[PDB]
Nucleic acid binder design. Sequence first.
RNA 1: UUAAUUAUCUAUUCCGUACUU
RNA 2: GUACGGAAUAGAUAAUUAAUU
Length: 155
Amino acid sequence: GGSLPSIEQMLAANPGKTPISLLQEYGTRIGKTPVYDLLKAEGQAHQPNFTFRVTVGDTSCTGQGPSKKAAKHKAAEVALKHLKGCNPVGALQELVVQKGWRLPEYTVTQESGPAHRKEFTMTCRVERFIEIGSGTSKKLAKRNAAAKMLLRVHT
RNA sequence: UUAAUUAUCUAUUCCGUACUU
RNA sequence: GUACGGAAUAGAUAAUUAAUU
């Protein structure tokens, strides 16, 4: 167990999780709760812009990012401080089609065990070339495999 | 006609963390 | 019962790129 909790102690004990999930764990000790408000949601489906605000007791702060996840993450990170007071897949497809080859293909060969810390290994396939990559999602794994493949097919 | 990328929402499944009964 | 977080599947919306017609 433990005693006399503090916001300085979480940074040494579990800084690996989001400040969103971590800031509410601190809220329970002080009786406060981090309320989340979306300040902004606009832009094209290629480079949009998001804003979050978090409120903990008599204080509130904001954060921003290219996604809903990145904007909420930065805002919780700012509250904690005051409480302490190109596409490789598309580039490869454009080459593979220009070289006269058949369209690229992707297949998973491996996966991690824990679902909360999932990982993937994916193979890229071209008319003569084959390469492998990995990532925290099947979409990220093919992106990594495409990045290594761009070095193989290109000369 | 085909392939690839990105953001948001809803539903389902799995997993992790905190609080509470 | 509540809040936050990741992965997979399905549906809806939107923008972008390449090849072909």
